[PDB]
Design a protein around this ligand. Structure first.
Ligand code: GDP
Ligand code: GDP
Lengths: 218, 212
């Protein structure tokens, strides 16, 4: 089994902790690989304060790096050996503070949303309150469906009402002890299985192809 | 009694709630009496990105107030002057970090001598006592490293709170630093703030402007 998981948030969002918080390890653009026959590439972005303005392109050009390299492989003389470097998922961390969606977020998402599968986790929810959380999410989704964005949507089914229970709110735990108050488990389930295979499916089918038709003007 | 209090943090930091919590780009001002307080809210910081520059907006507002005050003090008949100057800036550090976000370090070390910085540590219902501890110490290390001036409490009771700073907040003084502020909040204690503003910052401005 392989996986390539990209994490994206501004610093100090407790992501790099939460990763281990499912996967119980580490405290490691950048990539840290987990096996324990079963592989995960992990992708950390160092960047995302100061101006903050352009960069997103760094992410982009890395994605389309992986794509164009994969294509230029698929058309190669003897197609044989190709390993898959493409990025199935980007787990993305929204600032837990807000009344809304910070323009930085709205910009990155609507920028890269069709170049990868966005899983907008809501960060560090030990900040928030059930009502606060509620109004928050709804405010988000309103912000998106207003801004007309595509985040990868879970097809099959159990996952029926979690279309509604999204966006997703999180807590870092290696802490000595939980899906109750958090959305943690309700991810970890959807993490392990089988939903990755669906993710790779949507990446390779949807995003990649659109890239491939795209590049071809000549 | 009068006061002018400036609040500064990126949006969604729960400041504008905390203000009431004691009291029950652009720059701009609310005001109140309940004994006057002008309050000063900054719309911009946070959001943006690009925020490459801003902070000058704050500056030019400060030195607006100053230069207007001076140009008053030298006026034909000096008589009537009201004081618009800013005694205090309560400043909110991002509760998340392992450290001090470059945005902060830039604003502070930018305006630290143009006003009295009171760097509250934001929304501490985020944090943990150990987390909070290492956080503060990390901050102070960041400052004394970056050699910054935040207004320092004279007198005295406030003896060990020089140590108990930086200051951590909730929108109860037990777990929070809330009360340990509210006490130190203006009362007679503002009088020291106005003192340092008008004595220290203002004057330095006044000598400054005078090259000609
Ligand atoms: N409020 C909150 N804080 C957390 C959480 N997880 C970790 N932290 C704290 O936030 C700090 C930064 O977390 P980290 O994993 O380094 O996030 P990252 O720097 O964005 O990758 C850590 O020192 C943790 O103590 C969480 O779920 N909620
Ligand atoms: N966990 C936590 N949440 C807070 C706190 N203060 C405010 N909030 C929540 O976060 C949001 C920010 O509050 P607000 O005063 O509007 O922040 P501001 O815009 O920066 O002044 C509000 O909707 C509150 O529900 C706090 O001290 N702790």
């Amino acid at each position: 089994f392989e996986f390539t998981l990209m994490v994206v948030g501004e610093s100090g969002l407790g992501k790099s902790t939460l990763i281990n918080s499912l996967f119980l390890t580490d405290l490691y653009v950048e990539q840290s690989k987990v096996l324990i026959q079963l592989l995960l590439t992990i992708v950390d972005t160092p960047g995302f304060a100061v101006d903050n303005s352009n960069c997103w392109q760094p992410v982009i050009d890395y994605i389309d790096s992986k794509f164009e390299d994969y294509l230029n492989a698929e058309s190669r003389v003897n197609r044989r050996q190709m390993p898959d470097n493409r990025v199935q998922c980007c787990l993305y961390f929204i600032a837990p503070s807000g009344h809304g969606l910070k323009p930085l977020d709205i910009e990155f998402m609507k920028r890269l949303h069709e170049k990868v599968n966005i899983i907008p986790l809501i960060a560090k929810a030990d900040t928030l309150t059930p009502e606060e959380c509620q109004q928050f999410k709804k405010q988000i989704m309103k912000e998106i469906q207003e801004h007309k964005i595509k985040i990868y949507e879970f097809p099959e089914t159990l996952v029926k009402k979690i279309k509604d229970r999204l966006p997703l709110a999180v807590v870092g735990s290696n802490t000595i002890i939980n899906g109750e108050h958090c959305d943690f488990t309700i991810l970890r389930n959807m993490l392990i299985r089988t939903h990755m295979q669906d993710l790779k499916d949507v990446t390779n089918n949807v995003h990649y192809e659109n890239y491939r038709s795209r590049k071809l003007a000549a």
